[model samples]
Target: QGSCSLEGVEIKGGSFRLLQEGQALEYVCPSGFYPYPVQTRTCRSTGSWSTLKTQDQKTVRKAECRAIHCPRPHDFENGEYWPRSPYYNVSDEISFHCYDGYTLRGSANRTCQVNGRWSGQTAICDNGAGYCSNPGIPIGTRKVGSQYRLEDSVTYHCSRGLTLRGSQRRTCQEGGSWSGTEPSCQDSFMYDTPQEVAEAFLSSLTETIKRKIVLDPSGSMNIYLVLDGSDSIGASNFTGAKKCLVNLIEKVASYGVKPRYGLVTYATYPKIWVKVSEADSSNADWVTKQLNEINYEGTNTKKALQAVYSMMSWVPPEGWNRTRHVIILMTDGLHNMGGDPITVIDEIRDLLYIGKDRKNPREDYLDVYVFGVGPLVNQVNINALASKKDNEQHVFKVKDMENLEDVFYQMIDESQSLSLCGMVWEHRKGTDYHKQPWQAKISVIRPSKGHESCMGAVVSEYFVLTAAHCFTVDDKEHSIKVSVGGEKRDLEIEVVLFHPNYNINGKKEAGIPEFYDYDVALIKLKNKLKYGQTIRPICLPCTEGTTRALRLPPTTTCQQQKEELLPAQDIKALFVSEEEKKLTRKEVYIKNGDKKGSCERDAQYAPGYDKVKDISEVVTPRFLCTGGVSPYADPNTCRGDSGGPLIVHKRSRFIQVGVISWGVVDVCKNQKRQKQVPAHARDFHINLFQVLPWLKEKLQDEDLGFLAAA
Candidate 1:
């Protein structure tokens, strides 16, 4: 600050005008600063003036003059700085620091300008501490990583024996979430065998086995044609048998084994019409002429055997060289001769033994296969001759001569293959096991062919047994409508009886038993069945005791081994006739549990015996069970054949034994499984004998005549 003075010499030379005391003069702060207090100045008359200073200095001077000397401290960076003087300037520089865990990437400091504005752009801070953990690599190692913000990827592989079960890759999204469910690993196994191959093998084996054992395998099959020259066989029957023989000879030749044959008749003394020799295939005409010369003789196996024995003595052993020998003996009637047939059979056995002991064994064991050409033939004698065991093989009986050709062929086929050894009935085409000929046929009557609501027919005519569910009540007024046979004209409202103890829900009280109980109902037809092709009753087991007696261990039976060659005539007879010759019922004591005492006790009752009970007050007496030791060879029924009749020889007719029941699961299906219990593993059937008393009463009351009446 400074004070000023003014002195004048040439006052008149320059112009100076003195005005009033209130006159004002203007002053400026220059370009960088603006005027304060309207820019005023004072002029003294005595040539004296007030103080003068720069803006900064003037602000300082004014600050010193204020009574409030404590001015606010200047901190321009925090935007809290204050200036006391009106002309104070702002040129302060300030620096910035980022928060913890963050870093600034741009300029961190700036200067405040005189115009009150900061220099450079504002600094930016980022999250520098954030990072993700590395994921563990899998066995089939592969990996993918993040491409953008927070994105991630991973890969995997499968092991040597293992297979991958899910996605090969997984991903993580922007929000740190993973994609796809976790995959699994798995192991591989093998495939199963085809059903067709197994079925084919089974069918082929079954057929082959039945044929082989039934026929003679050796080359010398002596067919003694016992022509019924008694006048009943007629010229037609004789011609049929002759033609069948010629055809048989040709067939045997084709097998490379010429069967030696002989012709014998029984009008009076048994005579050998033709000696056993190789069939002359080349001289067809001569063979036919010889066959034409044959004439029917009165049927007499007794006389025939007597002559056969005489011939056997002269027959040269060296001529025949076959392993299995057979005799096709044809006849048409009962043995009227004085000689006993059984005694003759015994003599034949002795001759065979002697022949075997001899050097050449010319007298081979004979299978006296009797072809009963006419109805007059004694079936009993024929059956006896035909029946034999594996070691004592003998016998075959046929009812018709016309079937000779086919039977001969089958027998030859069997002889060529010894594996065939049982009877196989040709199941008619388009029929299932359920439609087996033994069962009774069912049909509905009420609804009239078209009006029937619950209409169904019984295809089998035997005791109509079926599942309880079949007659389940749909409502009060209607039950299952049922009838028997093809006519469907007769109708009856038979009493509906459910097993009394059979609880729809209760387990033990049920009569049918679990699983096996599916066999639930039995219907007695109002009228007896007339035994015919369309309607016939299946033969049931006689009794439990009978079933046991008939039982043969599975292992002890003669199973088919391989094929063998048989005589052509014998083979033809098997195919020609459907009538099975009735045999006498044989009784053999089966050792119960292999102990003599047990066998005695078990055999005390009649052949068939029944002990089980059903819910109906009527005792179920028609079931039978059998078997003694392990390895027995009796054929048994299976699951699907529940209601099948077990037939036995009664007098000369096939009679019913018992209905089939149930058995152990795996054992029944013939599967191999671990042992559980002895009784559980054993196969058993219901005793038909125990139920016989009740059955007889019911049948008698119902007027159901003896099964054989038809």
Candidate 2:
């Protein structure tokens, strides 16, 4: 009666296949989903598996996976989210819109990331649109902010019996930053929620990261987190502590390091939740599961310290000399069950440093940090437990669990800052087009119209590429000037070259108005354009430049680069529009128009091409199709959008894969808005891969090296 059979159970590994008495198995779920009831089950002595229960106390007999849901955005006040449902699941996207008199802050749209969290920052509609966002009211204080425009003032006053610290009034500045430090009402409550703490931590950590104070990127580090799970910590705070630990582990993992994480939880006695021997990076969730299975008992901080000391005593023979040891302990400092922790900490220091020279001891090998939380924590004990260093703070004190959680959240913000391309200069609520540095405006000084509208993309310091149709017999090299980024005066063009086979009248004998086959052109700048934060070249696919941008191996083949980029259909891309001197970005989905009712079908409906015998005469295989509103919202391109680069943003870099050639419709009202085109209206782009030979020959000396296909 003390054994479990292998029936009705899905074993993940061979070890768990032959199920027996006193055995356990962990259930796993796919990305963007969670296992219900519990993540693990155990075989009991009664020859039966341990049962699972739902949140409503209902028994769950079998493993059930549910879509990971995102937290309801209750804080998104003064705004409305479209398609409000019961709950949001993985792949479900929601767009936010602000009501009149309010300005939307944060991402306009957010998708549920694979991990149970929403993408980007939280969305909120502030009370006013100004140079600065809402400063927000502090706890135990009354704030006044009638306007948030530039040079606008905001004042704060503490509540009765509270003391105000920092600036009493702050003015919004030219750069959208506050004039002085934020005012706070000091009290026992350092923050109301964990989010505020996280916000503060993120700000400070960002500054530190920018200052070049970060972990080594070479991948040799050992991190040990010793958490106190005594009854005094309470179950809620204990959970919070585990969350912080998981977040920290996830964050440190992104630094491209070979991280070895050790976890030890202290209660009635110390238990090693995870050992230092694990090499795989998939331990964060496992550590979280193990931590959740643990229960609160009594305090034994000394026992946990001893456990850490024992784990750190022996180093692996491989790369042991350069390994940096970091011990982070989170406890309330009430060590009633164990002796003083200071002696054990001293023993650890002796074990690692005693053999070194006395005069110049190496302190960088080991770092001991302590986190003391809540009112009951003994600050004196923590000071003794933590390592003393002149440059770093090894001991931290927080008022509650939320503050600790916030700090952890801020620590993870560094991972989001490592992206290379598509870096917005001035991050505003909307208008990412103006922020794009690769955008170039080509102004045609024609005889009749003052300037023919066309957009180009910076592919090199001296080369701006666009559509060949952007120019005709009427335009000359002297008539064209290229405007990059926000430049007031456009730069003069040295030369312009269209594809040798570019023919607007391919069916001229058959009476066709325009034919855009091989519609690509390269503009040589008279002066080399300077590349900076606001003026840079976009990454082009199938080139060594893209390989460098992605940090791929130098021997990487062009097929691999193309596979990594155009891996599947419905590729998301963006193009720029110049309406009223404002460079605006529009989104579209690229799909092979070879389908029956796509590009080929839509081109037949064009005004002058209705008499065309075959649609192939108008649209060619060298063209990639976009437009129509399915899968994602598609923006109709106006006449001015011609010659813009159809770019896909990937891994923090924007890759130019296509060039805007022509469209079937010309529906336009003004720069502010345009009439939505019908589904039949489709746009075509010159696939760069089809015209790579010309680009390579022209740009070979232009600092652009084309890579060979596999």
Candidate 3:
């Protein structure tokens, strides 16, 4: 037996240390040369050290120090080095081997070449490959199937208490390789490395926040067409008014979350054909509807505004603290009789600034637009009805009503930019709700009166939808204004539309009305809005595939209910603003966020009547998945989170399915009285798919495209 020990003989390339009994003798090559054979010589326990074998299988024994040899490759995690030695020289034999369950491609065993490099294709180790040797598999693992085939994509998992830290599975590549590397696992107690956590926190800082942008003062808005019906507005002009109103309805309605419409043409008195119920108040259809049969008598602006204020003064449903109110006064502010219209304005103002002592009044509410059209139209009346700003943005005047048909639409179009129809930031793709420029947070401006808190999304060039009760006053839409989220801008809402079946308080004579069957609203904007980065509309669900293409994944086909019907499925709601009231997570700005929340129902449908045998037949069934339920509270859009959109993510986009309608515990009075209700309850939303007909009719208005040929 021979012993090899170069204790202090300046072992040129073997400066490293070694282990005992079958341990390796560390070796390295000179600067420009690589070691051959295995880089290590092992101790044989019999006072002898092993030698190297060449590619020819010839043994080379005993070199005090050989030519520079190749260096050992870096050790892999959960793996081992072969030959168990660190010394090598030219033409030496060496190799690597990973533990069980792992696979290796390339030359696992190779000879060190004369050029200080290992010969043959480079070695690669991957877990879960049949052909390649096993990558170092984690300890105590079990193998299921497909030991060798490229198929049966191998996946990895840790036993109880451990979790995967990377890709759990990997597949083999055609070129004798794998798609990715093996995953790592750690004890349950192991936390993220401090560096990773710090990096992630910094990464979040660069994301654009949708709620950060300040919006127009009008958040989720509403508007009323207060027109004049007098002799001065010739019969010809009256016809124009009807035609224009119809055109405007269709024009603005083309915008989604369309506005509700009403006709209040006044002579000696005003006709309340439509009372501004953004919920199902479309009896004023364009195909056959006309301005309230004109009185053509002494024009009375006072009566109309006064009447509107009186009715709008009622308190709105609970939690709608941010709805806005607006009015489009189109007429010759004229009248020799009836008191000054200023008096009417004062009353309307009072209704808007209600609940506060008269000492100081706030102008943050009530948006008034005067479309004064007539030869003899008095500027005084125009000034009175229009916002005090006196600028064209708040007031517009024309010499006659002749050119108004075309003139009116153009006017509003030029006046302001509105939410682009069915458009949102592409960057906000998928389920994130923040940093979006299209977040339509609505504030209910208490003009005559309305919902105090709510939210919504701009669905069209000039339309939006929000909780209907946002306009709380019974049978009124005058006081409800739509303000943009953040209260930075105001929306010029014209009509507030609703579903025919959305009866909030069905019987007027009945005790305080309580049912919110189909609580949703469509708000039409006066001007066609031009959308941009911060504000845009959400797309509607286009079932039968529009004339344009609909993007979808190859795996699934789009299936929508012909009637917007529900099947007790899951749903998602969005929110990212400060809740204006108590029952909300205040100042929360969630973004493009869709979570595991559901349209679930262990409960029945609408109007608080759950006496049905089937979930589908739950009381007239106007609900979509009402009240949201999520195991995690962070993603839950609370009961008071009204007016926002209830959307589903499909084809990598957001499709609005419902409107944040109502909840069981919306008010205190109903809460204590209903023992049948859950002590703690969930919120409900109105189904939008069911209202497609009405919505489409409005969307096709003013012919802003979207429809087939006339």
Candidate 4:
């Protein structure tokens, strides 16, 4: 009479209706969820069902129908998925829609099954139904044509507020491609001048002041420099163009991003000077030498474009690499050999979008820029060669030969290029001054003795912010010199504005020799400083500068901004430390510590603090603590770090959250031997958030904006 029944035991999505004693049963759960505990169950001879046990040896009371999670379709290219989520659970249905040019090659909809896999074949967007490649629809624009073949024309129309740049209509050409440059939905503020457009285009490529595109760290880009070595340009003009190009290449080669270069020159016939596989950042000097040695030829712009397209065809595992292409065509006259280069240009775009790796189609991969060297060049042809993006210029025409060299050099200047604060132009590899653009080296020169160097941060065009304790009452304005970047040049300080509340001996009555509370100070320059590659302002917390740098929405409260930036305790921060003339970026943690063994607790035991036992007497509420053994063993703040910024690196930009004020221990001397932070070696910084009012008052007139704190 002993039998295991289905009385209390529940099996979800299982076909088993009954269970007998001494019988073992195996079953599957319903689609989208898997069974937990065990998929197989056994009816034992003792009239009880066999149960599962946890890894910790706990008895499992109930069976679980755990939801199956499918892999995220993060790599789905040229399509959009509806009901997008961080992950897909059991029974979760996802629908797919291919972009206009691409056709859906698989299921339009798929559901997550119980086995942690999607229901059907993985959906893919592929170039379908045309001899030529599908012409992609740019964002904010609608394509009128559906077909992609010879003579098929596609017309683009932008949204109400947006403007259309590039050709209004493009037809599929003889070569399996579309005619003219890819059109874009541009903003009204787009530049018309060649220099302005060139600046905007280059800005898109880098993470400098303004970033139009987000470049992935693992990603790469290809630059093709096609020069017009025609007889019309002559030897002298060609020499000028080569010089300009050499300088530009040097700039790009020195940049942080990984870029491989290719070169092509044409006169009567096209010549492939430098191959993409042949040249890179390291061999930039070799590229320059190659450019210099090469002489002039007859005009053949079409052939040059053809040669570029030919070189582009051998992409070296091309489509899978996801390397962005930048083709710069420098010419003086029109195409005298071959026909219009438009067909070849379209074919080149085809190489980017069609027939190749269909799963890895990149819409923004190709950028073609045309530099018209002299007045003899055709404007319409130049415009056709370049990529047309919103508020960006691609076609540059210089009227004079002498001005071409200057204009080319100007395009590489990062000053006034990006509007965002706390950004570095070039990423230095194994080099100094990588992320210290806002760093200012302050020197207090005494006529009788040598100068004492202290570090500070550039807060605005005319001000260098530091710690008030860095200067003494006897120190004169003439004795202070502010040097920005690596170059040591004297910049006169018009006035020094130390915090009004700062008093060195404010707690002298309590037997504390010096109190560093409210130790922030600002140095106003005699002349307005220019924002350049190495010289720029660091973002300050709770200010509009930081609000804009953080890219928060308008009318966002300062409290909300703080919540986004420095909302929690033990936030990671960094500061520049000079170790025997060499600058090193030292990372540390900023703790909101009012606890034992913290800077506050350790300051009570500091020298001349025999009478001061309370934490508030030595360390005020406005001070942010750093340097401790627990949580994080951070580097101790050295003497040179005084007045420098305690910065947080966020979203590829640096924001100064605190100003280095003072420390309890002189541990820098023994820091080399002591790997971990000394238990009581505490450093304190003047919190920028606490002193927002003083900074706003001093910096408001200098065109710096302030946001209201919640």
Candidate 5:
């Protein structure tokens, strides 16, 4: 018989070895990998190698290996596995050993194997441990497989008139442990939080915005909101705190990720207000109602941490339901009611749990977060309460009682956020935007008032995302142009939807007539736009499925590319010159919007707007500041370019970052400020990052949005 050459293994994401044993080859997987079929093999006389089927079997082909584990060991009997279902990287191992005195006949080891399992054996203990010695099965239920061996499995069923509370299948492990939690025929109602039934989210972190973020659409996270509800906060402060909590729930409930939330309102001890459940995420209003109703008690930081540890210990099973355990602790940092809060960290970290890279039984710890809210509490121990310190970030504090909502809101935003989108094809950096097919020039043609226009970008076949202020059509039908490839024609503006916060006639922005906060809007075209490089629809800030129809690196995926781009990072923008009509490149830094001072600096606006009351409302964090005096570079956006593309480069392709919102100082003046000198101008973009949710919602019904769903 003939087979492929042994050198072929090098082409795969794998390595191979052909060793000669007295005239034969011995094979084993290289470092960071495990053998497939079996590791033990022999080299043939002709420099070829003969493979074995890991297990004692009749025959097989060349050895197979992987970066992670092989499929389930189809050859087991007594026990089962954790992550009832598993991916390539599973922390769980296989078991099939039997009770005391009974020897594990086959492979007696099968636990935590990645890339491959132990040959001739599975992850199990030798017989002698015995089965059901203390199986931990609850009282009143009936079990199927009473006798147990390492590879063997059992099923459970409730008696008539009685329902079981847990999974039906529980395999006895080699160490005398059950594969997963046992169910109860007893009527212990579903706990405070709904016990989500899943697999693979077994042990990992969700989009924490630190380290790396993994947004598995199929995964779920048990987000625990630990709120401090002590008497020191009083009734008014408590009310504000609850309001903040309510708003946070609303925001988290909107994301694409599956978030199973739990609530622990602490004072003397933590109250498990809402248990972890996707159903709990069902109604934010009701969740807030529950928060609003939490009563006062003495502060108990230690007890809260202990309870957090206690809750994490309860691992649910449904085929490796990898749960990203997160804890958002909002407190005063004053621990008075119980034990040492610091002392709790040891035991807190001691609780064994799952990890992303599959380091089994890693310390179970809350992706710790703390907020130093309220005026009366302590700031002395703020660092100790947070998960990471030194170059601290997780802990957020706000002094104002009335604005606690904003802090809570930012807490979720900073902790869990999306990335940069829409950046490719530019003019200045050689990646020119002049041939930008989707880059649209929007004009609102008036009768006597003439044409009020701004720039826009084509996001889909049916919709164009732009600034609400771009269309100043009050009453009369606004004639709109859809410029594609430096020349799109008059496309009828069917309707326009401006964001709720786009109010310009009210406040003194000091920098402008009407502040362009929430200035982004959506335009519906009567006809759908076609595609290809000549006139492509510019990719919008990602809303999930609206994916890579553009030419990009094949080795990478759209979501992977998104993770690389959308994170808080610096980017560049393209502008259309008024006098020259040429595209100019302007590099910009996307400073985190919520950062202090809101990325603001001393600047000017139109006449009468000089005296500003609060710049936070006008120069809000919603608009990401791009180019400014701090290590300034690149020319910023200019006049008549209110809605052009602010893009970012990801290797070769570019995704739009923001829409040209507004800028301070006359960009044309370049340098001359008050006494005629080159001064700096900090330009802002109508953050497309912020516009995404709204656009996704409005386009949910359109055909253009089908891909995002797909």
Candidate 6:
């Protein structure tokens, strides 16, 4: 016991060996403790261990040698350890602690080794109770969640009659994430019934509605006479025909319809007989004078047809008024040089029968009356030429020397009756025409000085309408004079309204340079219309509701007739040239469909004047196309006739639908020519329907009513 009198002593720990004063000693820490300071402790000459002792160790009195120590804690700091008991040595300890809200995830305490440190690092106190709270419910919804939970669920629903487009239920996940798409509310029904339904309902009510109201107590009718003056008629016959026409004009003046007559005649080419003026029907002086100026040369039925067609295309003026469109064809013989009479008749028939085809229906119909004069006239042909429903009584025949006065009286009586069977019939059966009486008239105005490149006219005032292209440039300031009606001297023109968009460079290169689309102008006269034979405004369509038959087809028989009338020599000459031959062959094959016809026949058989047919085929979409047969039939617009109107009778009124713009040459019959040729004879006008908005904006205060205008 000499206190063991140890000068230097040593302890050996796990996996380590040591010597004390040349002797070995054994030492180890508890299970969780680890060794430190080389895993050994040494004794000094003082009789105590060489390891340093700490205050805690001194207080404990006994010190046992072991590895480093640390308090029971989740973590540790540096420089804290423990030493061996009964031996003075280094003894240090380290401690750890957790953050305020977080809890310890691992062991709370640890230890230091026997050779030089304390038991273990300090332990930490932990609490694991923190959690997220539920959020408030969104608008238009309710939440379903416990107050203590991290998140809650919500279900949404719209009020009655409302629909929810998105998710009906939603849940707020742990991280504030939602489970479904956003919710929205909408209505059940969004659109109204279609327009057709309203129209059908109104149509059903027509049977019970009586709309007849006479405008005139005297029982008078306004009569518009469109006469044929083609060159084919004999000179004497033309004169005699004029006499009968004047007599009938006078007789209609006395009728209850109180006919106000205007004469329009078409001859070598079609032209207005008196430019539609208010004249004394009883005197017959103006009628005789205007009729006397009629040319007795070429009978261009096509021109006559075009003139009448143009009149039909005019836009009605205003109000519900009834005017009769009576086209009396007084040609002495069949159509020779111009459009085929057969084709003309067929067009009329087709127009009448537009809606008859159950598969293809239309909204309205036209009343066309035909009268053939002279011994050479074919009544059967004339009869066949009439529109499908026109009364047979409407077709009259007058021999060259027959009692012209008698014929006129008979025709006048029939017209005055206004009882030409289907002439004024309703579109739908049982509907009455008397309910909505209507009428229309068209006027052509002379073009102004700077408007030679423009084409059509607009009716600005009662007596006069203006166009741009009517004035021709001769020399410097004094251009060609503009004459209206029969007077050689210029008529008094009150006002002129040039089209704002009119352009002069649109002229086409043909026999005569023809101008197109940019060609329209309008005029207004200072003098009010007499509303008699000379001039008057026609009734315009109502603003509401659509009339069916008023719409016409894109293509007409007249255009086909134009293609067939090419001169043979011109056709041969056109095809004979190598360059033209190649082009003709290529184009014909490309354009011709599967049908086997002249185009597909031998190249030699192709007409020399094929250019005419080719030009006619490419007519603009705005144009109403017609033509097909050769020689006897042709469809074309001619020179000096540009800006003329295309007319149709709707609801007892003549409506203008198109303006004459251009024409194609008869290259099919002319062989010497190599390429197709065209005479810009057709007319172009502002599309009423297309320009309705502009018209409405310009004429905001004035009621446009039902009629379409530009």
**Residue-pair clashes per candidate:** 89, 1, 114, 7, 77, 166
Candidate 6 residue-wise lDDT, 1-710, digit = tens: 21333333322323323332233322333222333332334444556554634424433233333423222211122222222223222223233445555444322432333222233222323342314322222222323443323445656555443344334555554554444444433221111111211222223211222222133333323334555554334355466666566655554443323443455666566666553335463234565666667654455666566655544333454321233234555554445465575665456435334435644433123334455554334434454444332011234444232344344433333233231211222222221112111111123333462334222222222322223455433322232223332223443444444455444443234421343343344444445323222222321122221131222232323222223221122121000011211111100011122321332222222234233334432233333422223211222333333454433333222333334433333344332233233322112232233333433444344332434342
lDDT of model 2 at residue 519? 96
Q: Model 5: residues >4 Å from true position, as ranges?
A: 1-434, 473-475, 508-513, 545-579, 593-598, 603-609, 669-679, 703-710
Q: Please name the candidate that would achieve the greatest TM-score relative to the true structure.
A: 2
Residue-wise C-alpha lDDT for candidate 4, range 101-161, written one tens digit per residue: 8887556887764345465544657676676666665433577877776889989776554
**Tens digit of lDDT per residue, candidate 3, span 296-379?**
338777888875675465646542334456677777546536777777777766556632543433443566766655333554
Q: Whose TM-score is higher: candidate 4's or candidate 5's?
A: 4
Q: Candidate 2 residues 408-479, lDDT tens each? A: 654554244322233332332334343678888888887655678788888888899999998886678898
Instruction: Output the TM-score of candidate 1.
Output: 0.27
lDDT tens digits, residues 610-686, model 1? 23232222112222333232222122233333433433332112234334443333233231133232321322333
Ranking by TM-score: 2, 4, 5, 3, 1, 6
Between candidates 2 and 6, name the one with more favorable lDDT. Answer: 2
Q: Rate the local accuracy (lDDT) of all candidates.
A: 0.36, 0.66, 0.48, 0.68, 0.52, 0.35
Give me the runs in candidate 3 sitting further than 4 Å from their true place.
1-438, 445-451, 472-478, 485-487, 507-512, 543-568, 571-618, 627-640, 666-680, 702-710
Better of 1 and 3 by TM-score: 3
Lowest lDDT 10-residue stretch of candidate 3: 582-591
TM-score of each: 0.27, 0.51, 0.33, 0.45, 0.36, 0.25
Cα RMSDs, all models: 53.0, 15.2, 36.7, 25.2, 24.8, 49.6
How do all the candidates rank in terms of lDDT, highest first?
Answer: 4, 2, 5, 3, 1, 6
At residue 237, what lDDT does model 1 achieve? Answer: 42
Q: Residue 594 in model 4: shift from native, Å?
A: 7.6
Q: On residues 309-388, what C-alpha lDDT tens digit does candidate 5 reach at each position?
A: 76656455662335556677766536566666877666655543333333453323345655555333454354355554
